[PDB]
């Protein structure tokens, strides 16, 4: 390793840093919330009706335990486009409280669905701001809700003053005064009422088709999770180094039991440079402290490889008792354990030495390691 | 009643659900500015034998939400109304608690009645409530029901001189109505003591509705202690409601070893500030 | 009544000569004093890992790092060399004398009190009183929350060696005069040294014989005052706590660097992985990536040129060690204020104290010369 | 000043910059350190002494000409000919752009000060040898001063009273 | 900020923002350098004085 690192094939005497040296991960767990109940999408995909866009409806799920995989047993997607979370990876989060619009509306303009997007559905009947993390999803619509002679249930606000803000409705029903002449009239010209009906007519081709359309608005935010996805919890280890998954909190560390008292609005114990020092469980209201695992530095420290070619390890700032639990078969980044429990393992302030023989003389110093201790190649 | 005051250090809540120890942390979020000035509106209760009209719920434009603060021994107030137009036309809020729940319906109400007062306004023995919760008159299309526990039970008073303070500081915000308590047992002698004390979160509610205005409901059926006093402008009187509003400043909190917020500081008052 | 008031400066109080060209003054009384001056020799030792800093041992991130070169090869080079130049500047300023001489069983210097500065056996470690109150002065949960792959080594001679090499110096100067920086050293009771010294500065040898009981008694008093006069003043060691103050909130610094978004979704790796796909997680790993790397620049380079800083001192405090206490300096206001006789070098964390011994004229008259 | 640079007083700018992180105060922190730093060289070089001596009114030094050094009370500013030459011959709408948030402050000590920091050391020289750095000031007339000069480098005193006038001469020509 | 939306001209301001970050690292630092080389001046000054 040492040659390695020197991009050499040849080292001189003195003490040289390779890498660092990590205890890895021995086992999982997952801890989930305390719910089964399932949510009802099936409310609003399995409808008699959609509202129009004009008054966009809203529905809120929370609460509930909730399975995607069932969505997909309704019907095929026509777009399926998630716009901030992947859509694979839907069944490991878990949210706050999700939100539901859901219309029927002409799936030639389905486009405009977008953050600051154009034409009347993105400017001036709805809108998407640019902080918008959640999906959107649609389908046919023609052949299910037309007409023949002409379904008007379906005016859509086309005239206002200035475009309408994201996530805000108006149902403001008045003739829009589109000219110089005073609008005063219930109608006429110059007065043009900004709704339009259509022509949902069955035998119209693909140029105006109408298809449903939900936009989920996920919501994500630091606060309790109601909604979560279809996983299983297990059991919590203590005082090992395990991946643990508290609600979503992807990590890696120890876990004791903490001694600072939570508040009851209290969630997490974040600290400097965010770091979830202390958090509480889900399934029983007990707090835990979060320790990171053991790491360090390793440094060689040789003779010249003209004279010999013997070795020691210096592991630099950890305790010699916490090495032959990290000595194991591939358990370090330097995944050699050669040395593993060697030659009279001697303990320094400066760390933990393997392979050198402690003597109860004095000479002047050859290689220094530090806190007065230095090294140096002599017989017996 | 109308009379201005100084509110030496109130209004400091927890601006989020973290933990934090022994941690000088800024943060720059909606607060009550520092010795800054709040309006007195007093119940005025004169002559009872006759019918004199009292009119104790003057309009307030709730301009990015309100502190509010009450010294009283019982339930005068019984909760409060919300809403831009408080009518059938808009949508509109009520939150009130009974001795047993709370209720919050934010619901299209056709109109609401006045706050129960009684003719008689016998308060030498009017100590007891009948008949008193036919408000806002029926209801309509609406959701979002929360009969929940009630905010306040009571805070024994013994032997007399411990008024209880009451804080309150709701907010309106990206659709979520957020209101902190925090209930001060000790009165002492000033009526708004210079102390600090945080405001811990008492609830979060999703509604997301328009509000530019709200009422105080009372229950003016028995008041004491509630004279009235022509004085307007910059005078001084007795109120025991105390009203202020909130404003986009920075301020840095101390979090002690036990997570308490001991200590503020705000960051546009002094330059040594 | 207390008030803020602004004002011209007074470039101190004024004063005159009387210049007449048949006239002179001469001094006929003297006094000893003794003082006190601080140099830095050496700061912390730091060092830094590139790929646990930058990535939370992610391997993706891990292979951008990879893929954009060798910088961090190189930011991990400058920061050893920082570390060798340190043990350098410790073992230069002070490992002067290759023996250690020891203080005789029975201490009387002709009337002298060197007490205050000598080793102290009764104490568990061997230390000197102004010794103790330099170390108690200094003030060196939070150490152990650096530990994001910023680590600090340990120094190579321990405080015992250098309380040892202090008392050796300290002991020869004494004992031996000056001889022992030239060659093998040549006992010598003090009193003739110290008029030694006063021939030195052009003084005959005929007033110290006369005044050692007064000069005895000048030079226990300052040296008893010293003691009072460096722990009552507040800010008198604010050139060694300068140091402490500056690594510390470097490190702040850098640390807290890391809660930065830096116009990225989140600042922590792992919400990005599990809420993105790859190929899209890949420009906010790259957005992320970039200001970490900076901010390590910037810390190694301020490292460098503060290094380049103390070195600086360090070769001043070097030469003054040389020249003022293994022997005496003819050069004006090197070693003290006045005429300079002596130094002694106290030891203090992350530096060094040298007590400069002088000699000024005292009582003056002025008669008419030719 | 960061933000004044980055950014015209735009609200979008600043919003952007604040979210980089703690960048220009950092660097705002880095330029402070430099003036105090340039006040304490300036302080550490010319106050080294803590009186202010003054030369007598009649100037005659032995028979040495100090006129080009010592001050002139007649100018305006009271400054050396020596001095006024060097503070001329350094060439110091072109300040006036440099105000898009940049800023040059102001030396700490006048160069009146420095002037009379300057005075006080001339004239303590001249008037008291080299004594008035030690301790407390003795005058000495100027031809002894010399002598004792001479004695230093080796050549002894019968030397400078012998040959006064043509060392005089000497130094007011090399003056000169 | 006049002639464009700000969705789109956030990575314009990103662009420009960067390279003006970049010339102020450089003249602090230039100026750091400079004002460690006057010292050893200033410093070689006062021992001649
Ligand atoms: C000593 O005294 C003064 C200066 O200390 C000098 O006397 C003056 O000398 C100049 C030049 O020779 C004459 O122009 C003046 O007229 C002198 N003064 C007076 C009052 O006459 C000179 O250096 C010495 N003078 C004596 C008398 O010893
Ligand atoms: C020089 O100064 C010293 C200190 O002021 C004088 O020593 C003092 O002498 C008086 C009278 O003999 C004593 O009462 C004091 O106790 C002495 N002081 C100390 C500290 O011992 C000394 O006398 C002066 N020189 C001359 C020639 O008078
Ligand atoms: C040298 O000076 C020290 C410092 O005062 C002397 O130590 C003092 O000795 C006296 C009497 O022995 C005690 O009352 C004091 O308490 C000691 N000082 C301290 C700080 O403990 C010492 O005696 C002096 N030695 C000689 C030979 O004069
Ligand atoms: C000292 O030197 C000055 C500088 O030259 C002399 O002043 C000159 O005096 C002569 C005759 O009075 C004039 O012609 C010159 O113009 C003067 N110089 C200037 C710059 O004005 C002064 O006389 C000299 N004094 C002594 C005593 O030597
Ligand atoms: C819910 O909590 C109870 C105890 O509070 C526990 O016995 C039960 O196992 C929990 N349910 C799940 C699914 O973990
Ligand atoms: C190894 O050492 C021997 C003797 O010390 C010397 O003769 C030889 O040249 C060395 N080889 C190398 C490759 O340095
Ligand atoms: C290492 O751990 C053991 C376990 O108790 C402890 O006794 C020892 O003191 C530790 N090492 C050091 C240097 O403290
Ligand atoms: C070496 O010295 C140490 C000092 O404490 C002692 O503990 C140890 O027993 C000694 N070893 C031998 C072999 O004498
Ligand atoms: C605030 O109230 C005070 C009385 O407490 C009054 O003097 C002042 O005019 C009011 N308005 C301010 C400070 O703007
Ligand atoms: C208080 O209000 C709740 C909510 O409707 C009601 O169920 C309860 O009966 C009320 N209690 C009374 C009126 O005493
Ligand atoms: C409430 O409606 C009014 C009417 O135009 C509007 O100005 C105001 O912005 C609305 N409230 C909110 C919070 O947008
Ligand atoms: C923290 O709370 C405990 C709980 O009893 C109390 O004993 C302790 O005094 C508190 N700490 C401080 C600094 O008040
Ligand atoms: C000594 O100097 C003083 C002023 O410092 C002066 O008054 C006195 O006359 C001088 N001595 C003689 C003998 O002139």
New interface residues.
């Given amino acids: 390793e040492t040659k390695c690192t020197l991009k050499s094939f040849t080292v001189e005497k003195g003490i040289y840093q390779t890498s660092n040296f990590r205890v890895q991960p021995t086992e999982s767990i997952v801890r989930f919330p305390n719910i089964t109940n399932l949510c009802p999408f099936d409310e609003v995909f399995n409808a008699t009706r959609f509202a129009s866009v004009y008054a966009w409806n809203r529905k809120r799920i929370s609460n509930c335990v909730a399975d995607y995989s069932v969505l997909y047993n309704f019907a095929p997607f026509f777009a399926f486009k998630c716009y901030g979370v992947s859509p694979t990876k839907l069944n490991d989060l878990c949210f706050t409280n999700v939100y539901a619009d859901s219309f029927v509306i002409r799936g030639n303009e389905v486009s405009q669905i977008a953050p600051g997007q154009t034409g009347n559905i993105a400017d001036y009947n709805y809108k998407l701001p640019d902080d918008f993390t959640g999906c959107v999803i649609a389908w046919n619509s023609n052949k299910l809700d037309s007409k023949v002679g002409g379904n008007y249930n379906y005016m859509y606000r086309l005239f206002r003053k200035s475009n309408l803000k994201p996530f805000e409705r108006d149902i403001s029903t008045e003739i829009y005064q589109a000219g110089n002449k005073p609008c005063n009239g219930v109608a006429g010209f110059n007065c043009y009422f900004p709704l339009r009906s259509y022509g949902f007519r069955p035998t119209y081709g693909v140029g105006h088709q109408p298809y449903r359309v939900v936009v989920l608005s996920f919501e994500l935010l630091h606060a309790p999770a109601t909604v979560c996805g279809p996983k299983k919890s297990t059991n919590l280890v203590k005082n090992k180094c395990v991946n643990f998954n508290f609600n979503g909190l992807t990590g890696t560390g120890v876990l004791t039991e903490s001694n600072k008292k939570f508040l009851p609005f209290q969630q997490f114990g974040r600290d400097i440079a965010d770091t979830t020092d202390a958090v509480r469980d889900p399934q029983t209201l007990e707090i835990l402290d979060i320790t990171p695992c053991s790491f360090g530095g390793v440094s060689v420290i040789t003779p010249g490889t003209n004279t010999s070619n013997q070795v020691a390890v210096l592991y630099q700032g950890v305790n010699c008792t916490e090495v032959p639990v990290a000595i194991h078969a591939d358990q370090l980044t330097p995944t050699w354990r050669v040395y593993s429990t060697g030659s009279n393992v001697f303990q320094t302030r400066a760390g933990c030495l393997i392979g050198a023989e402690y003597v109860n003389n004095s000479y002047e110093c050859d290689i220094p390691i530090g806190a007065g201790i230095c090294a140096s190649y002599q017989t017996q | 009643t109308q009379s201005y005051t100084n509110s030496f250090t109130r209004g400091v809540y927890y601006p989020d659900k973290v933990f934090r120890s022994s941690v000088l942390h800024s943060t720059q979020d909606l607060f009550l500015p520092f010795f800054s000035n709040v309006t007195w509106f007093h119940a005025i209760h004169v002559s009872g034998t006759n019918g004199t009209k009292r009119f104790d719920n003057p309009v307030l434009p709730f301009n990015d939400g309100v502190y509010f603060a009450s010294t009283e021994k019982s339930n005068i107030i019984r909760g409060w109304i919300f809403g831009t137009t408080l009518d059938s036309k808009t949508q509109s809020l009520l939150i009130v608690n009974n001795a047993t729940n709370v209720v919050i319906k934010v619901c299209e109400f056709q109109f609401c009645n006045d706050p129960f007062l009684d003719v008689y306004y016998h308060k030498n023995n009017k100590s007891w409530m009948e008949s008193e919760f036919r408000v806002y008159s029926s209801a309509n299309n609406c959701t979002f029901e929360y009969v929940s526990q009630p905010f306040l039970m009571d805070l024994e008073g013994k032997q007399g001189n411990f008024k209880n303070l009451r804080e309150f500081v709701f907010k309106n915000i990206d659709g979520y109505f957020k209101i902190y308590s925090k209930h001060t047992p000790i009165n002492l002698g000033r009526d708004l003591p210079q102390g600090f004390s945080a405001l811990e979160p008492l609830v979060d509610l999703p509604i997301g509705i328009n509000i530019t205005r709200f009422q105080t409901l009372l229950a003016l059926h028995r008041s004491y202690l509630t004279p009235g006093d022509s004085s307007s402008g910059w005078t001084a009187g007795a109120a025991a409601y105390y009203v202020g509003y909130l404003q986009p400043r920075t301020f840095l909190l101390k979090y002690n070893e036990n997570g308490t917020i001991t200590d503020a500081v705000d960051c546009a008052l002094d330059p040594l500030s | 009544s207390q008030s803020i008031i602004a004002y011209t400066?007074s470039?101190?109080?004024?004063?005159?000569?009387?210049?007449?060209?048949?006239?002179?003054?001469?001094?006929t009384n003297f006094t000893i004093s003794v003082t006190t001056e601080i140099l830095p020799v050496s700061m912390t030792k730091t060092?830094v890992?590139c790929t646990?800093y930058i990535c939370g041992?992610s391997t993706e991130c891990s292979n951008l790092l990879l893929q954009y070169g060798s910088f961090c090869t190189q930011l991990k080079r400058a920061l050893?060399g920082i570390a060798v130049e340190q043990?350098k500047n410790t073992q230069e300023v002070f490992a002067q004398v290759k023996q250690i001489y020891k203080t005789p069983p029975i201490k009387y210097f002709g009337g002298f009190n060197f007490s205050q500065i000598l080793p102290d056996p009764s104490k568990p470690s061997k230390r000197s009183p102004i010794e103790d109150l330099l170390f108690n002065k200094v003030t060196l949960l939070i150490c152990a929350?650096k530990?994001?792959g910023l680590?600090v080594?340990?120094?190579?001679?321990?405080d015992?060696?250098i309380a040892q090499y202090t008392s050796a110096l300290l002991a020869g100067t004494i004992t031996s005069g000056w001889t022992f920086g030239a060659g093998p050293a040549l006992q010598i009771p003090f009193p003739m040294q110290m008029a030694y010294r006063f021939n030195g500065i052009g003084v005959t040898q005929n007033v110290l014989y006369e005044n050692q009981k007064l000069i005895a008694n000048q030079f226990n008093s300052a040296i008893g005052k010293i003691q009072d006069s460096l722990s009552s003043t507040p800010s008198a060691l604010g050139k060694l706590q300068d140091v402490v103050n500056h690594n510390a909130q470097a490190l702040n610094?850098l640390?807290?660097?890391?809660?930065?978004?830096?116009?990225a979704?989140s600042?922590?790796l792992?919400?990005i992985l599990?809420?993105?796909?790859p190929p899209?997680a890949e420009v906010q790993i790259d957005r992320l990536i970039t200001?970490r790397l900076q901010?390590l620049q910037?810390y190694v380079?301020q490292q460098l040129?503060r290094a380049?800083?103390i070195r600086?001192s360090a070769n001043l405090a070097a030469t003054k060690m040389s020249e003022c206490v293994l022997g005496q300096s003819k050069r004006?206001?090197f070693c003290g204020?006045?005429?300079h006789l002596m130094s002694f070098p106290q030891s203090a964390p992350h530096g060094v104290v040298f007590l400069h011994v002088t000699y000024?004229?005292?009582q003056?008259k002025?008669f008419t010369?030719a």
């Fill in positions: 400066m470039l101190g109080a004024e004063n005159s000569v009387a210049y007449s060209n048949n006239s002179i003054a001469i001094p060092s890992d646990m041992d050893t043990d929350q530990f994001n680590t080594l340990p120094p190579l001679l321990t015992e060696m610094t640390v807290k660097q890391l809660s930065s978004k830096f116009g979704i600042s922590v792992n919400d599990s809420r993105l796909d899209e200001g901010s910037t380079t040129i380049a800083e600086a004006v206001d204020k006045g005429y000024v004229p005292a003056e002025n010369t």
